[PDB]
Every structure is written in structure tokens, then in C-alpha cells.
DNA sequence: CTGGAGAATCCCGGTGCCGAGGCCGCTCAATTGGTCGTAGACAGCTCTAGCACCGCTTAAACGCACGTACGCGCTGTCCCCCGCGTTTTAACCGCCAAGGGGATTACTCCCTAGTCTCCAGGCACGTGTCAGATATATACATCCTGT
DNA sequence: ACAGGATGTATATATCTGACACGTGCCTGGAGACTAGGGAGTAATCCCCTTGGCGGTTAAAACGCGGGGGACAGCGCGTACGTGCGTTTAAGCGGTGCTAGAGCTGTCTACGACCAATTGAGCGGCCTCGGCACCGGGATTCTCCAG
């Protein structure tokens, strides 16, 4: 038994949209946050709640950018998102 | 009732004291020095509670994972009339055992690890238990730990602690054990404070201790040697750059960037053990091995004393460490030497652990070195065969080390056990050894009853 | 002196008139603040509070819960055309995404 | 060699392909090209740089070595990225 | 401990029970509700302050807060918020 | 003679991208501003520069929207602007 | 009839097609569809409504019957449409 | 009383330190305001002013005209990446669009 | 009778002459420069005000302006500007 | 030298006075009452300056557009030795005339309109002029006008003003004319103030005026009749709704919306003239119907007095109005009556204007009504044939009306001219007529020299 | 491919003009100098919470291979833009005329901030208990295949 | 076209756990009630600037319609993305110990705001010779088409 291409994916669009959880693993993100900050100032410490504010803000930003990317893909009559659709969304938003 | 052999007179007196606690209706602590055969005193108590009081009811034992196969073996050996069962394994195996063995109620002793209890807590609270034995009871010293909370929710007619290090760091960590045994007596730590020259007054009713130096005059006493070592020139370089906090080191170019140091003490401790623990420190990305590695660590330069030992009869040795990577570099050294060895660690699966212990202990066994991580390998396992102990690292808690040494100094040890402790001379390893000794003073290894 | 009555009780409000007056006086908005300014502002903040909690409580009820949680609040704000304009640039934590799948994407029939 | 068994990736790689796919599924994306995964990492890194640089400017001004939750909330607010839930 | 922390939480709960007597609310949701009240307060007082300055006045009055509400809120919320503010100020003035 | 379709469109782009004049006629826009306003309040008079401030802001907004709209049509592999390209640009902007 | 010779259009129609075409050309548009004129008028009217409504709120607050250049500049500023040249 | 010396002369600036202090004091920015604050702010306002007018002057000479006009200012701000980031949400009156066609639209 | 209106025009003129001695400027370009100076003054002063409230201080000082400048200005503009302002305070405090 | 006919004794005396101004080196104003042949007194002066002083140099005349073809005709008739040329037409025609006629320098008088001067100002400033004659000089009364500025930049040996309404609204307006003539005498209006019972002292040196009542005893004096009229019921309705400002009226539904009234005075003035000027007011979108037009306007109800006049010999009539739409409704009324008529307005082309005037003035002409707009048709044109004048509207400035009446009362009028002025009784038209009469008092129609 | 013709801005030199820089006068906000009182620097202390390591469990991600929906290059198609000229209407600019209403200054007197004093709302605190969680079970959905 | 087979999804019931919910004790911002002195409001004055609309003149909008550009549907082709297997991996959760550095209280003294007094930068008013808009002369040089 194999489901047809595209049916498992729609099931997923439905699950993740219902849930409210964070999707990136948390240890991996904390390490990136800490590496980016070493460039600006050295030897900083971080409240446990401060990295969670960064992760909530980051995942909210990426989910919203993926909506604009999918409308720019469907405008060009495709269902597959591509790097050019991300770039047009970021240009029309002025960033 | 006890079949395969005889309890020594102190084991007989300990049994009579445990029976007297039961008949007086009290719980208590059995805390003989390590290597005094505490295990058999407990197995004999359960035989009594069945053969003489007619109580075949359920009893529980909690143990560290590395000792689950010893306890089971001993039940099978000395008192075969008890019906012991053991919980361990993957989710399917635990579900199958619960369904097909535990709930049927065809057994009288249940043996488990602390993780298996934390997983199956909702199953085990169904039963009403007659005895709850915890081993290495120092594990529950912090009352806010999840095991300590879970363990106080059980229905139990009787409670028992077995530990040879009843004192650990402070009087609150001992009160936390008394509050499991008699919560209605030691109502608070603020009440234990003040009660406290009040030596043995509170303790004698609920504690019994005997020392090998009194009760086993035939066992040879330990010999202890500190070996102070200098740093290598490479270690002296890194130890100074770490203090300055200009380690730099970046494998992805960026002119070496900077390594972050929010905790410098751990970086200094790593360095003392070996420079290669750090990134990019080994010379030559190909790696190469050979004596270049040996020449860069002041501890390893001295560790070639293993060659004298091997030639000096079978002075088989145990090596203890606190860092998992150090066992890696010691294992590459032993493989490059072509030595015969064993290794136990926290990563090891359960089945493998007991096979290793057995293979090393056989009467005709050829393994010279056993490498043990200090947390997983330092508790319960018995290895009377080896004559020597090496402590490569030093722990903030003095009691952790003491236990590790006693893996060898135990009943059945025919020969004097030598303990070698490595210390880098002008470094933070001095302060660590000084504080551990400051903590010994308040304990004083009280002999007690 | 006479026994105290809160200024919120005089205005017929649940939010605090006194705290609001202090906040305004110490926030460096103007060198003077009027007596009716804190009462008008407390009325508006309580009205806007009630508008959100009415929609959030309906969302909790439809989901069969007795307790409002951060997801119920998102659903309320984003399904109301004025609250979603008032709050178009705020991120609510543990607030999900309204469910929407574009039509082109769905299976054929 | 026991000593070299483990190998380390860059910290950007910790944002895995499975982690990006779920975010696009919450956004309602059905199918994704394979070059979108490196493009997304570049975009997040630019977002984190701009928020963190400011959160550290606030921390330095207060003469503290610890970044707090309020330092992050004020930086997001100043850029039009208001966040509720973490105080303020 | 040794330091108090003011919040709107008790006021949000007193209104909750008038709107829905049966329901309760979580601590995470109450923290979002405290953030909403703080954000809206800072918006309305920023427009009021500016209005006074443009017109060269020293005082913020209810007439400046009424205009700030009309500049900030969408049309159906603005007409109701102005009705609730004017009802409160009339009632307050009758007791004063 | 006849130039070819689109040749004079390029001269017009260049000519209007050099000059800074207002392109909409002034008197017709003044009547538009006044009608919209009579719904918000009646009998308003107006400063002459207040109408020029409204025209400058209005032509600046439309020119910028037509640039975002053109990018969208090129993205869809076309050269002619369509009503759906204005709608995509406004939607992605957040209007 | 001399009396009825002239006929009046709506005021939106005053924005003619020749003019929309020029504002597209300043924006670099080469070719335009015939439906855009209706669409562009709808879009400008929504822009003028939102700016004027606020410019009149400011005028009423000042108790004046004349809309000034400053009333327009403050309304554009409050919406993120800052304008230089007309004062302020 | 000694001869007066205006605070801008003491700091070596052309913009007015005294006026900036009044504007800050009466503008509701803080309960108090320090004496070094108007000096720092006047220096930054004069630097940013000189940064624009320098490039505006060059755009005027490129057009061969002696007076700066409002288009010259637009050509300067838009052609510099940092001034265009500082002034990214601003419209300038009598300001044209920088000359530009997407290459897709140019003839073969 | 007719009241005075303040502007930056005479300082803008004196700075132009220092940069390009022979160049002039039209009255409309002056209105735009006067608008620019006021926009940038209001941005810096608004950030400097908040930073003090966040840290619970009642005084605006050169340190709060320095942080405000680093938050608002782009990267290279910020560097040169910071140098110009710290230079001006160094010269002023030598001659106060 | 003058050929076609003989000047009258007052024209002879006026010529001798203009010559005496030239020989004294002064400029001056000729301001005889309208209808007194100022045009010929001027043409005769130029003939003198050529035949007796030997000055054939360039001379300029500025005129209203509607009189350019009269002036030219008169030059051709009385003094054929002057070489007069005329500038008028599209850009190509002006370029062709400048290139092929003006710059050649084969002419001695140049005749132009005020618009043609403002267009060709840079061409005409090349030449050095001997005389600059402005006619209807009241046009330059505001010194801040463009024409007034442009006109003071010319190189001119002599200047001259012709006007029959030398006073208009105030003493500054008259100073503005003196400052063109002798700018070095009347240096300022603050100096003319104070100089001012100072009647004729300043004026006599530089002004001459004669009145028809003194110098043409044979011309019949005017008869003036006010006719007060009530509003129609429809006008009474609109006049009340306009005052309330609840006009409503919206053709695109919207429940009639509201109409904007930033100036109510002009709305009230419109209504008095006719209700149909307003939108949606004429009953029935088809329109077509006609007797209803006469009824819904109190002025039009009375205007059927045109039927008595036509039957009462050829009392041919001129109708003056200030609103162009009113000539529309009067033209539809005349077309629906099948009357014979002419119309002149501001939108008429130049060629057509003079044809109309000629057709109406012919000895055997059959046209009964001439419709004239008051600002274009009210100045310069001569129409001695008509016996009657109707003023449908009333102007704020009294002098505008006076001129319009005089289009008929002039040399060559054989019969008494009747003037009828319509006034709606209880409306703002009362206040307009009262204000215009308040301004007449300060002028007083001074006879002067 | 490409010569040729012929409409496109493009320099060039003259002509006039009200924009911009100069100065005048004199207005009213900056600076000197003194004084007051309290923001904030600073030293010290306490003790919370942020950092490392390992032990142990098992969700999770890794890579492999399989096979199909859909990415995107050519072609034909035939509608609706672009460009021209024509005729046509209304925008721009100049003109006068009136009087709405921005603006000034002046007067008077309601409003709010200040102070001190006072006692009850709101803070954190600690504890019982019930919405919520999730375990097992099944019943009904919807997808997929092959015939 | 649509029969069973297979799968994930729904919800029924059970017991279970840990965030909410009450009330307690406690203490510091809100509230009383006068005096203070300015902002604010309202009168009245003056005269800047906005609303009509004719007259005249050009320019820009409008109409119509020849003709070739681009929009768009369809086909076929082919490799890049979905899917599921088994596999290996590190995130997570717990636990130990240490000590950096957030936080507080009590103390002391540089700083800024304030006042009154004096004087000069900066305001508006009145000015004018020179920047550069404009017109009408010729210069290449854009583009296009029929040889
Ligand atoms: N009575 C006894 N007879 C023989 N051997 C004994 C006896 N008691 C203890 N031992 C030996 O002690 C060793 C382990 O002792 P153990 O029970 O682990 O001590 P503890 O539990 O105190 O660490 C076993 O190898 C066993 O042979
Ligand atoms: N001396 C005269 N002889 C014959 N006809 C004359 C004489 N003077 C004037 N007219 C006629 O009287 C008419 C009015 O003259 P006009 O120049 O229009 O006077 P004004 O210009 O002062 O109104 C002219 O048409 C002219 O033909
Ligand atoms: Mg043991
Ligand atoms: Mg005449």
C-alpha cells in the first residue's frame, strides 16, 4: 500500500496547522543563537526565557514568509515553491 | 533456611538487628563499610519474613542498572525459596512483562532500576507492598528529586535503606533519608536542626555500622599514593592561553575567531587531563597516533608505569575517570600498546555489562586493564580480582572516589590493594583535592554501632 | 474625614482609575493631566478587554474547554475583521495559525 | 580511532530539512524544491543578526553581561515585530 | 519576593466573570492579556501627547483622548469605545 | 512612417523618469479631494498647499505600486500588467 | 437645447486614462491591460479616504473649518507616509 | 560679567547648541537633561547635514547648474545605500524617480 | 504684529558654504533640509527617552544619545557620527 | 487733412487740447461721456503728428478684442494717409505677421488686443514708440496686474488714456492711472492721499470731460425704469432650502446626498435668475416641454413684455446678463417663440463678432433681439439702432452697467432710449442694487472741463 | 544583411526676470552667575539561576531505494493592445469682487498640582482539589486498489 | 463504473496528575481635603487669503480604427521530488556541583534646574543685479524599411 504523491502532504498541512507547538528542536537553535552573538560582544550569558522569545519570534517570521512564498508560486501557475518566490516576497515587502 | 553457605557472625548479628527493627515496628538504615557483604544480610531477612512470619507478600528492591544481574544471581544462590522477578527493557518488553508476569501475582520479590520505577510508577502503585528496599540510598539525598517524590507515594508496611556512605555533603542530605523512613518522627529539617557533641544519640536507634578494620582482621588494609605531576610544554601553553581567554581556535577559517569561555574552571580541568580534548589541538589532521600523543600529557608520561605493573606479576588494574573522552584516548593507547582490556561506561547496554564483569573476574582470565567511568562503574559492581586502582581524575565529592576504590577491596580480596591518584601540581586540581579533603573532615568515617 | 470610595466605583468601572492616572502623570506625555482623562481611558481599556474575552470564551466553548488558552485568543483576534486590523503587527505566543489551504492545492474530482 | 569517531557540523545545519518542512507545512505549502533549504538558512540568519545586535545594545547600555527576555522584546518592538507573552 | 510586581491580572479576571461566569483562564493566556492592555495604553497616550503639542497645549484632557481613540481604532470599535468613554465621564461627574 | 508597437512606450518611460512634474491634472484632482471630504464633514474650506500636499503624496503612492505590480508580471513571465498583479502586490505588502 | 449641451461625469472619471498611463510609465511599465483603469481608480479612492478622514479629525480637534497643509502632513506621518517639503 | 561665548563656539560647531537644549527641555523627552546631551546631538545633526549637502552639490555640478534644487537631493539619497536605508519611508516633493527599466523590457 | 517662525536655514547655509563654497540652494530645497533636520531630531530624541524609562533613570545624557544613535543609524554612518559627537563633547568640556 | 466728414466743435476743441498737451510735454486723459466720438479725436491727433510735426514714427493702440475691427475701419475712413496694421490670430499667424509685416517697418500705427500684447511683449519692446494709446483704460486700474506691469516697461515718448468711466471704485484705482501717465509726478499713493473740497484742482491739468447733456442738445435723454418682481413658488422653495443649506440634490442616487455651499450668496443670485440653473431642477428628464420655462421664473413671466414691444413699432432690444447659462435659456425661449435674434458672448470668435454687429445694424435689418454678455459685449461696440435696453441681472460695480446702457445712447441715435432693470423684491438682489448705488454717490458723474 | 530617408532630442547663441543674496533695523531668547536640593555613583552584601559534565531512554533524523506528478521548452492560436490622425472639449491663467474666518491681543477666573496625612486594595504567600491529560479500546471515515 | 481491503481518524470510557483556585496575612499606593498660581476660555479686533466664473487661448483629451505585438492553451518530454524502508543518531530529560553576577540596602556629593539681569544672534523687512526659463537658429543621430 502506497499513498499517492501529494496525499500525505495534505494530511500534514492539516495537522501542523491545528497544533500550536514549536517545530525546531531547541538545543540546536540555542547553539546558533549563541554563535551569532559572539560576533557582537563576547562572553554573554542568556536567560532561559530569552532564547524562547527568539525561537517564537523566528518561527512566526518563517511561517508568515512561507504564506507569501506560496501565493507567489501559485501566481506563476506552479504548486512547487522555489528560491525565486522567496526573493519576490522579500522584495515586495521592502526587506 | 539459607542454603549455599554460612553468614559470618556480624552478618548473623545484623540479621537479628533487622528482625528486632521489624518486631519493634521501625524502619532503619544498614550501613556497613563497602565490601562487607551487605547483600546477603538483606536476602536472609526476606527469607525470614516468609518462613517464620508466613508473609509471602510482594516486596520491592530498587537498584542501580549495573547491579541488576548480581542481585538476581544471589537470590537464586543463597535462598531459592523466594520467587524473584526482574523488570527491564524496551516499551514492548515492559508491557509484556507487566501483562504476563507481574499482574498475575505468581512472585514474591520484584527487582527494578530507578528508571524502570520512574517509567512504570502507575503500575507499581496498584500493589500494596510489604517491604521497600532501596540500595545506594544516597541517590535519594535531595528530597526535591523526582525519584524522591515518587518513592513517598507508595503503600508500604516497611522501608529499608542500604548504603555504605550514609553521610555525603551536609546534615540536610541525611535528614532527607530519615524523612523517607520515619516522616512522622523527623517532621522537619528545622526540627532536625538543633537536635543535631550530640554524636550517635539520634543515630543509634535507626542506624548500624561496622568497619572492615574491626570485623575482618584477615583482609589486607589499603595503601594510598598521591603522584604529583608537571604539565607538558603544550599543556603549559594552553593553560596560559585559556586563562587569558584568547584560545582562538576555529576550524572554518575566520582567522581562528574566539572560543567561548563562560565557565573557565571546566576548561582548565580538561587541559590537565589531555590537550587533545580541545579542538584542532592534535598535531596533523591525519592524526597518526604514536608517542607524540603520549608526550603531550604529563599524566600519560607517568602512565607508562603500567609496563612495570604487568611485568610485576598479575597486578591487574582498574582505571577510573570522570570524562567519557578520556576513556577514548586511554583505549587508543591500550589498543596501540596491544594490551588486553575491558571497558564499562554509561553508554553500555545491560547485557554487555555483566558479561564484561564476568570475563574479567574468571579464575583463568587474561585481561589486564579495566576502564570504568566513575558514575556508572563506581557503584555496586564487585571486582575482587584486581590488585590496583588508578584515579586519573579527582571529584569534588570525596565519597564518590571512596566507593570506586572499594570495587576491589572487598571480601574475597586475597592481597593488598594499591591506590594511585594523579594530581597536576600547580593547577586547579590542587584546589579540587583540597576541597574534597575539607569535606572528609566533617564526615570522619564514624565507626558507629 | 469621610470613608474612602475608589474613583472606579464612582465611574462604574472594573479597571483602576487611580493607577491609570499615575501611569499618565509619570510617563512624560504632557506636563498636566486632566481629571476626566484617566476615567475615559479606563473605560476604553475595559471595553476592549471585554470584546476579546467574549470571542475567546466562545472559541473555548466550541472546543469543549472550560479554560481560555493562548490558542483560543488567536482564533478570536484573527476571525474578527476589526481586532485583526487593530492587532495586525503583533505575534501571540503559542498562538497557532488559522486553518487555510488554498484551493488549487486540493485533490481532484 | 575512538578519539575521532564523532564529527561536528556548522550550527546553521542544526536547522534540519525535516525542521523546515514542518514550518512550510504550517504555512500551507504542499511541495518544495530542493534548493529552498539553503535559501531559508540564509534568510533566518539575517533575521537573527538584526534582532540580536539590538538586544545586545540594550544589554550593554544597562551594564549587564546577561541577555534578558525584555532585551529581546524591546528589540522586536522597535522593528515592528511586537511579541506578546514574555512580559512588557 | 522582597519586591512586588504590578499587573492588570485581577481586573482582567473580574471582567472575565461578567462576560462568561463559567470559564477560567490559564497563566499563559493571562500574561498575553496583560501585554494587550500595556500595548493599547501606550498607543492612545502617544497620540494624545502629540495632539496637544501640535495645538500648543499644556494639558491632556478627555477631548484629546477621545480624538486619539478616533485616530487609532477601526470604525465599529471607535464608535463603541467613544460611547463607553462618554457614559463613564457623565456618570463620574454626577458623583464628583 | 510608423514606429513599431512598444518603441514610443520606451521614450515615454525615459521622458517621465527624467522630469519631476505632477502628471495628473490639478483641477480635476481638486474636485475629487473635495467630494470625498464632504462625507466626513460639511462646509470645509481648504488651503491651496494642502491640495498640493495631497497630490504629491497620491502620485508618489501610485508610481511605487506600479513598480511592485510590474515585478509580479515579469515573475509570471509576461510584459503586460493585469488586475491580479495589483492584487498580489497589495496582498503581499499587507494592505 | 442650448440649455442641455453640456454633460457631467463622475469626479473619479477626472483621473483620465492618458494620465494613468503616464504614472505607469514613470514606474517603468511598458504595456497595460484595458481593465487597469477601473482597478486603479478604486485603489486611489481607498488611499484618499484613509488620509482625508484623519486630516479632518485633526481639523475638528483644533476647532477650525479650513483643512491646512499641516493637517495633511500629520495624517501621512501617522500612517508611515512621511512627506518632506510642506513644513514640519 | 565676562564676554559671552555661545556654546556652539565652545564645542566647535555651526549648528545651535542652545536651541537644541530648549527643544529637548520643553519637548517631554525626560524629567531632566544633561549639559553634554545638546552638544552631542548638535554635532550629529551637523554631520548628517554635511553628508547630504556634499552629494547634492556634486549632483548639481554634474547637471552643470550652480544652485541645488529638490531633484538633486533625491538623486543623492537614492544613490547612496545608507542614506536610502535611513530615508527609506520618505517622499521628497518635486523629487523624480531614479532612471530605471527592467532588462526584460528592453529591445533585442 | 506678525510673529516669527524659527528654522535651521541659516545653519544649513553656513554648512553648505563650508562644503561647496560656490554653490547656492533654492527655497524649496531649503524647506526639504529643514524637514530632514526635524525628522532626525525627533527620531533620536524618542529613542533616547525610552531607553531611560527602560532603565529607570530620569535624566537624558550623552550616553543615552550615543546608544540611540547606534540603534537608529545604519552601520557606517553610525561609526563616523559617533566619532563626531564624542569629539565635540571632548572639545566642549575643555572650554566650559 | 481729415477727409470723410467734419469734426464737431467739441471734437475740434478736444484736438486743440491734445495738441497743447503735446507742446507742453505732458500726457493726460480724454474722458468725454460715452457715445461722443473719442475714437475720431484720437485718429485726428495722429494725422496731425505726421502732417505737421513730420513724425511718421511707430505708434501703438491697445483695445478690447471686440473693437479691433471698428478701430481699423475708422482709420481707413477718416484719415487714409496713416498706414495702420493689426496683430491677431493663432501662433503661426502671429509669427508670420511679425516676420513679414511688423519687423519690415512699412507702417506707422499698430493696433492690438491686450492678450496679443501679453503674448508678443518681447517683440514689441524692441521698437521705440512715439505714442502709446490705451482705450478702456479702466482695465489697468490695478497696478499689480500683469498688463499694468508689462505696459510700464515700454520706451514711449508719449502716453494717452481714453475712458468714459475715469472713476470706478476708489481713489487708489485712479491714482494707478496717473502713475502710468506721470510716474515722476505722482510718486506714490501715500502722496496722492492728502493731496486729494479739493475738487478738480489735481484733475484739470491732466483731464478733460464733456457730457452729452451739454454738448449734444439734439440727442434725446435716457428713461430709466426699475421693475420689481416676486419669486415663483418654485423659486421661493429653493431660496428657502438654499438658506437652510439642505439643497440635497444628487443625480447618482445616494438619497440626494448634499450639495456644497461654501459661498451661499452666489447660489441665492442664481436662483433669482432661474431655477433651472440648478441640477435636477427642470421637471422631467426628457425636457422638451417649453411653456413651463416661462412660468417657473418671476423674471421670465414679466419678460413676455417683449411681445408688446415687437408690435409697438421696431422697438428693437438689447438684453444684458452676467451669467452665460442665462443667455442659453433666453436663446431657447427666443427659438421656441420663433423670434429673429443675434448673440455675442465671450466664447465667440473674432470674425463672427463683427459680422453680427453689422447684420444687426443694417438699414433694412430684421433682427429684433440682441443678447449680449455684460463683460464682453458691454464695452466699445456701437449699436445705435436699438431703442431699448434690458438689464436682467444687476452688477456690484455700478459703472459696468452704465457702459452697457450706452451701447445704444450715442451719436446717431434718433430716438429716446428706455432702460428696464429687473429686481426680485425680497432677496439679496435688493442689497446688490443698494450697494451699487452707494458707490455712485462718491463718483457723482462729475462734468469736469 | 543593410543604404537610405526623415522625425528625435539634442547644442548653440539672444533675449528678458522676478528668484536669491545682500543689508538694514531691532526685536526677544541665550548666557552669566548664584543658589538650591536630590539623581545617581559605589561600596557592600546576599544567594538565585545559568553553565558544564555525564547517564540513560528512545523519538528522531539519517540515507537508501523506489517510481510518477508535474517542471517547463515549442508550437499554434487569433484577440486587444500600441500608434496614428482627427475632432473635440476643458484646463490654465488673468481678471475683478466679496467677505469667510486665521490671526492677534486682551481680559477674567476655573482648573489641577502641591503638600501631608491616612487606612484598605492589592501583593505574595501557601494548599486543597478538578480541568486536563492520555491510556486503551473501537467505531466509523476515507483513501486505494483491481475488475 | 465502483467492490471490499486497508489505513488514519474519531471519540467512548476509564483513571489519572499537576496547574488552577481558594483564602490567609501582610503592608504602601490610593484617597481626604484644603491652598497655590498659573493655563485656559472667551471678546473683540484686524485685514490674510479662499470661493466663484467670466474671457480668452491654447493645449490635452477624446474619438475612430489599421494592424502585429503578446497572452495563452495544448502537447510532449524527462529528472527532481514524494514516499517508505531500515538504519544510526543526538535531543531530552534527569542528575550532580560550582560560582558568575542579578539584585538589594545604606551612604555620600556632583550635578542640573531655578532665579534675576544683561546683551547679542537672529528675526523680518525691504532690495537688485545675475542665475538661468524661454524663444527661435542648426546638429547629429536615434530608428525604420525597401531595396
Ligand atoms: N558470607 C560470605 N561468604 C562468602 N563470600 C561473601 C560473604 N559475604 C560477602 N561475600 C563476598 O562479597 C562480595 C561482594 O560483597 P557485597 O555484597 O557486594 O558487599 P557490599 O554489598 O557491601 O558492597 C561477593 O563477591 C561475595 O563473594
Ligand atoms: N463728428 C462726427 N461725425 C459723424 N459721426 C460721428 C462723429 N463723431 C462720432 N460719430 C459717430 O458716433 C459713434 C460713436 O463714436 P465712438 O467713437 O464710439 O464714441 P466713444 O468711443 O467715445 O463711445 C461712432 O460710430 C461714429 O460713427
Ligand atoms: Mg553493594
Ligand atoms: Mg470707444
Residue numbers in the entry:
A (entry chain A), F (entry chain E): 39 to 133
B (entry chain W), J (entry chain X): 174 to 369, 382 to 634
C (entry chain G): 11 to 119
D (entry chain B), G (entry chain F): 15 to 102
E (entry chain H), I (entry chain D): 27 to 122
H (entry chain C): 11 to 118
Give verbatim lines from the article:
Here, to address this issue, we develop graphene-oxide-coated EM grids functionalized with either single-stranded DNA (ssDNA) or thiol-poly(acrylic acid-co-styrene) (TAASTY) co-polymer. We chose to use SNF2h as a test case because SNF2h adopts both monomeric and dimeric states on a nucleosome, with the dimeric state being more active. Using this method, we obtain high-quality single-particle cryo-EM datasets and determine high-resolution structures of the SNF2h-nucleosome complex.
For the double-bound particles, we first applied symmetry expansion to identify the flanking DNA. We did not notice any significant conformational changes within the nucleosome between the current single-bound and double-bound SNF2h-nucleosome structures. The RMSD for a majority of histone residues and DNA base pairs were below 1 Å between the two structures with only the flexible flanking DNA exhibiting larger changes, as well as the histone H4 tail, DNA at SHL+2, and DNA at SHL-6 exhibiting larger changes from direct engagement with the second SNF2h protomer. Since all the particles in this analysis are double-bound by earlier classification, this variability cannot be due to differences in SNF2h occupancy at either position. Therefore, these components suggest that there is increased conformational flexibility for one SNF2h protomer on the nucleosome at a given moment. However, considering the proposed model for SNF2h conformational changes during ATP hydrolysis discussed above, this asymmetric motion suggests that the two protomers are able to coordinate their actions on a nucleosome such that only one protomer will hydrolyze ATP at a time.
